[PDB]
Amino acid sequence: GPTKATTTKLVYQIFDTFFAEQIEKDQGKKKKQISWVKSYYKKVCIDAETLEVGDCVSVIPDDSSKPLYLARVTALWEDSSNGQMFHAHWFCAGTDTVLGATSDPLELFLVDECEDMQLSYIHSKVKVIYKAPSENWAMEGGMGKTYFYQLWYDQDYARFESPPKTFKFCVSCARLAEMRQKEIPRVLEQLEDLDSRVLYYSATKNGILYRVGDGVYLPPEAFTFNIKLSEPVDEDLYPEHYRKYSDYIKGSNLDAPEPYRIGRIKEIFCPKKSNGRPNETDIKIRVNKFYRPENTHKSTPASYHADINLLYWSDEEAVVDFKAVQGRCTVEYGEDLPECVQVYSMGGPNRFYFLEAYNAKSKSFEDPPNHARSPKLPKLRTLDVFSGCGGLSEGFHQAGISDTLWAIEMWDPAAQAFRLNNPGSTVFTEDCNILLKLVMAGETTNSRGQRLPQKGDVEMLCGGPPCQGFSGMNRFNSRTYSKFKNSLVVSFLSYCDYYRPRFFLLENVRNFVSFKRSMVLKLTLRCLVRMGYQCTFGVLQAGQYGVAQTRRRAIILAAAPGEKLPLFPEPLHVFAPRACQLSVVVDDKKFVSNITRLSSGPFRTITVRDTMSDLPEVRNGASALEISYNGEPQSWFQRQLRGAQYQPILRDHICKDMSALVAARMRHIPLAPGSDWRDLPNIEVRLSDGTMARKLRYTHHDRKNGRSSSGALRGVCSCVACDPAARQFNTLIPWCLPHTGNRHNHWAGLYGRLEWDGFFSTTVTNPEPMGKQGRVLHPEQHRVVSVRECARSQGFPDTYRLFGNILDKHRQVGNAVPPPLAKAIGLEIKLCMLAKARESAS
DNA sequence: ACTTACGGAAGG
DNA sequence: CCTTCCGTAAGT
Numbered sequence: 014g015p016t017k018a019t020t021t022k023l024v025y026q027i028f029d030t031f032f033a034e035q036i037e038k039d040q041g042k043k044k045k046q047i048s049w050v051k052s053y054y055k056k057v058c059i060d061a062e063t064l065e066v067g068d069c070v071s072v073i074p075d076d077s078s079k080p081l082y083l084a085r086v087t088a089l090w091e092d093s094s095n096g097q098m099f100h101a102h103w104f105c106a107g108t109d110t111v112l113g114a115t116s117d118p119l120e121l122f123l124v125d126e127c128e129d130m131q132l133s134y135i136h137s138k139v140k141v142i143y144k145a146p147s148e149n150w151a152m153e154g155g156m157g158k159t160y161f162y163q164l165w166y167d168q169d170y171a172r173f174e175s176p177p178k179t180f181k182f183c184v185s186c187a188r189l190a191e192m193r194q195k196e197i198p199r200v201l202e203q204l205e206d207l208d209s210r211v212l213y214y215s216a217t218k219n220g221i222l223y224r225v226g227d228g229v230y231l232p233p234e235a236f237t238f239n240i241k242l243s244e245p246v247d248e249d250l251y252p253e254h255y256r257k258y259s260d261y262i263k264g265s266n267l268d269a270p271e272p273y274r275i276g277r278i279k280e281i282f283c284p285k286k287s288n289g290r291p292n293e294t295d296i297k298i299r300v301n302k303f304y305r306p307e308n309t310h311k312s313t314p315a316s317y318h319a320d321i322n323l324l325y326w327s328d329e330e331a332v333v334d335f336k337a338v339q340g341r342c343t344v345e346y347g348e349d350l351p352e353c354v355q356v357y358s359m360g361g362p363n364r365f366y367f368l369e370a371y372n373a374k375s376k377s378f379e380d381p382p383n384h385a386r387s388p389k390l391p392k393l394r395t396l397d398v399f400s401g402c403g404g405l406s407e408g409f410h411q412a413g414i415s416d417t418l419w420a421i422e423m424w425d426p427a428a429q430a431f432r433l434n435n436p437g438s439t440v441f442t443e444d445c446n447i448l449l450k451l452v453m454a455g456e457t458t459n460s461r462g463q464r465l466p467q468k469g470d471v472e473m474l475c476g477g478p479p480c481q482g483f484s485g486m487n488r489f490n491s492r493t494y495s496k497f498k499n500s501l502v503v504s505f506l507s508y509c510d511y512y513r514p515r516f517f518l519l520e521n522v523r524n525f526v527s528f529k530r531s532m533v534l535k536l537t538l539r540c541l542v543r544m545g546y547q548c549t550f551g552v553l554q555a556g557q558y559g560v561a562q563t564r565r566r567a568i569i570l571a572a573a574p575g576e577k578l579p580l581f582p583e584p585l586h587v588f589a590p591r592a593c594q595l596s597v598v599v600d601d602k603k604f605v606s607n608i609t610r611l612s613s614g615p616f617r618t619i620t621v622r623d624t625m626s627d628l629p630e631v632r633n634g635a636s637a638l639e640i641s642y643n644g645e646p647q648s649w650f651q652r653q654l655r656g657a658q659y660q661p662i663l664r665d666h667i668c669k670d671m672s673a674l675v676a677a678r679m680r681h682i683p684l685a686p687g688s689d690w691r692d693l694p695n696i697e698v699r700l701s702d703g704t705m706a707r708k709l710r711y712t713h714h715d716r717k718n719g720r721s722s723s724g725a726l727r728g729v730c731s732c733v734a735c736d737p738a739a740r741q742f743n744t745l746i747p748w749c750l751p752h753t754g755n756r757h758n759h760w761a762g763l764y765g766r767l768e769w770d771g772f773f774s775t776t777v778t779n780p781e782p783m784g785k786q787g788r789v790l791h792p793e794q795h796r797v798v799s800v801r802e803c804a805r806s807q808g809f810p811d812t813y814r815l816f817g818n819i820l821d822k823h824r825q826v827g828n829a830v831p832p833p834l835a836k837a838i839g840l841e842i843k844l845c846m847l848a849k850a851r852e853s854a855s
Numbered sequence: 856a857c858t859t860a861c862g863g864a865a866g867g
Numbered sequence: 868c869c870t871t872c873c874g875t876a877a878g879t
């Protein structure tokens with residue numbers, strides 16, 4: 014019996030209906046509808062009432078889909094031909110945003126939608142008040158029908174942000190004009206005038222300044238290098254091989270896009286027009302190419318041991334239109350920098366280095382020529398709710414922004430792992446509801462003599478509520494267990510409301526944005542905007558930020574009104590197109606995050622080979638904890654995880670002890686990519702212990718699948734439900750997968766083998782072959798993926814201690830957030846705090 | 856403590 | 868029509 018969630022009155026008032034039993038109280042044309050007081054500006058007008066500037070009015074739409082429109086008058090000028098004009102800056106009602114019907118009917122939002130309009134279209138004068146956060150907004154934990162507005166709404170990305178504090182002065186007009194000037198690339202600093210073109214030293218695009226000698230990303234189609242590029246099985250032996258007709262290899266990186274084409278700008282020129290003057294509309298850049306290691310004559314096999322940010326210089330140049338440039342990088346000579354390249358790589362984002370030049374004609378490496386050489390903030394005190402082993406906390410710690418001073422996790426192994434990993438934090442082993450109810454009163458000491466965090470002592474509240482009820486792998490979500498699992502979101506929001514931290518982060522599975530027609534996400538956003546927070550939501554792919562594993566996780570961010578709402582991080586590593594589906598459809602509206610890198614990215618994809626090609630071979634049912642490395646790291650991922658320190662001890666290289674039948678099943682699965690249970694031979698086998706494996710028998714005709722070529726049947730039960738003795742044990746082929754494969758996508762990926770060039774599927778708590786996520790066997794060895802292999806799939810450093818038995822270690826590793834993803838989010842928050850500090854300084 | 860049998864909505 | 872994927876009761 015889980016304990017009910019304790020909530021403040023504020024949070025309970027919104028979640029009252031959904032979790033009723035789980036919480037205990039604690040534009041188009043318009044219709045015309047008339048006197049005065051180049052362009053003459055006057056303060057007031059008389060439409061039977063004294064309309065002025067700064068007060069909001071209403072506009073009646075012709076269509077009946079929207080009841081009425083609300084606008085704000087910004088200026089009142091007179092036009093001769095048009096008539097009496099005024100500039101209307103529109104409002105978005107609460108029932109049209111992402112909040113849906115959840116928002117109260119008296120909530121309005123600012124938007125960047127404005128236009129000129131005639132005075133006859135005004136229907137009535139409506140009072141709208143700017144509700145603002147109080148001076149004690151940080152200390153409001155736990156507490157007439159006119160329209161009020163408090164937040165500004167970005168429709169494309171579904172963002173809420175505090176109103177921007179900045180003669181017909183319209184904020185929307187200025188912002189849109191800034192956008193128009195942002196999109197157009199503009200050129201400056203004339204250098205030399207030539208007969209057929211003009212030379213320019215610098216240029217500007219989207220607020221980024223490009224100069225002769227910088228680095229530029231280009232799309233994979235921008236140019237190309239000079240190097241030239243590039244049976245019916247027996248139905249008796251494999252009765253279930255006919256199910257491999259989809260011809261879609263799971264976890265394949267073959268179709269992944271290529272990374273960005275890096276280059277160095279050599280000159281900027283414009284072609285002279287027919288009038289003898291430069292054309293500032295088309296800008297043509299000449300760029301020296303940079304060979305990636307997989308672009309040389311040595312193909313991808315050259316990108317197994319090489320650094321992620323390594324390139325080769327070349328003397329081949331190309332011409333590309335300026336609009337194709339997709340960013341800026343710092344491609345600097347490796348030995349030019351006084352510091353080592355290892356520190357330089359982490360010195361800043363978007364940094365590449367080259368050390369040797371490449372010649373395509375002779376396919377040889379030379380010394381790059383002479384001209385190619387080219388000669389604080391205090392960390393936020395953090396409370397982390399529902400931590401576990403502390404993936405998010407570790408990511409933020411290595412991002413350099415946070416400092417986890419408290420934790421909430423009752424499960425003993427996870428709590429002790431958190432204790433071991435963060436020696437300076439106080440971890441509570443209790444229920445979140447009990448601790449919150451205790452801290453409502455000034456208890457300031459729990460039963461174990463630990464100090465609870467007081468109001469004003471928490472600055473960053475981060476965590477992820479249990480996602481076992483939200484996930485799609487959960488067939489029982491209407492039971493009490495799943496409901497009480499879902500109800501912890503309300504407890505998390507209660508902590509957020511009570512403490513009022515500067516930043517609030519809620520992580521969950523992707524299905525969180527679609528559970529019960531996205532009712533939970535909508536309710537969370539409504540609570541966040543009712544608190545007074547600036548909240549945004551999105552879906553991030555874990556595999557695009559450094560890990561070798563597909564994991565789409567929903568992130569909800571919020572910041573205090575004085576703060577700035579962080580932008581979602583930009584992808585760094587390319588990933589398979591079928592995996593990067595980050596759009597969110599809520600109430601038939603499609604929201605996409607501010608992420609612009611949708612196709613490609615700077616760095617290349619991380620594969621399984623880069624993850625676990627250095628771990629020594631281990632046998633099934635391993636139990637040794639401290640083993641020794643048999644070799645140095647053999648990739649960038651392993652070199653980064655292990656570190657430059659001399660540690661020859663490997664921990665947590667253990668695999669679950671599978672029985673004899675499961676070992677025999679995982680022994681007969683071939684090593685070819687895309688292999689799973691479907692091609693298991695149907696032959697009698699002798700297990701490790703002395704016991705016989707029967708042959709699976711098909712006694713019932715399969716109507717939907719028909720009969721095989723040999724005439725044998727395909728059904729295994731009376732389902733087309735189960736008679737007694739229909740189940741058959743001790744068979745190499747499992748019985749359940751043939752029994753119910755027709756209505757479950759033929760159980761693709763069960764007993765599956767990872768491929769070296771592929772990627773991990775979404776890691777779960779228990780890596781068992783027969784689970785819904787079943788692609789767990791090693792690419793070569795006949796065993797399940799070890800604990801260390803799983804932790805590397807999640808990007809955990811090899812020096813990240815885990816506590817408990819093997820099942821508890823697997824649960825800790827599979828329940829966490831990949832530290833690369835948390836590091837990216839922390840870097841975005843670092844940018845936000847740096848901007849706020851810079852604004853505060855001057 | 857361990858093993859197994861597997862619903863159904865969303866997005867292309 | 869195919870693919871996703873923080874797993875859970877039920878049995879043993």
Ligand SMILES: Nc1ncnc2c1ncn2[C@@H]1O[C@H](CSCC[C@H](N)C(=O)O)[C@@H](O)[C@H]1O
Nearest residue numbers: 014015016421422423424443444445446479
């Ligand atoms: N029947 C049950 N009733 C209540 N909790 C249970 C339970 N079965 C398992 N649990 C535990 O509930 C945990 C998720 S809720 C526990 C975390 C809690 N909110 C906190 O303050 O830290 C799981 O780790 C699980 O170990």
Ligand SMILES: [Zn+2]
Nearest residue numbers: 127183185186
């Ligand atoms: Zn305007």
Ligand SMILES: [Zn+2]
Nearest residue numbers: 730732734735
């Ligand atoms: Zn059956």
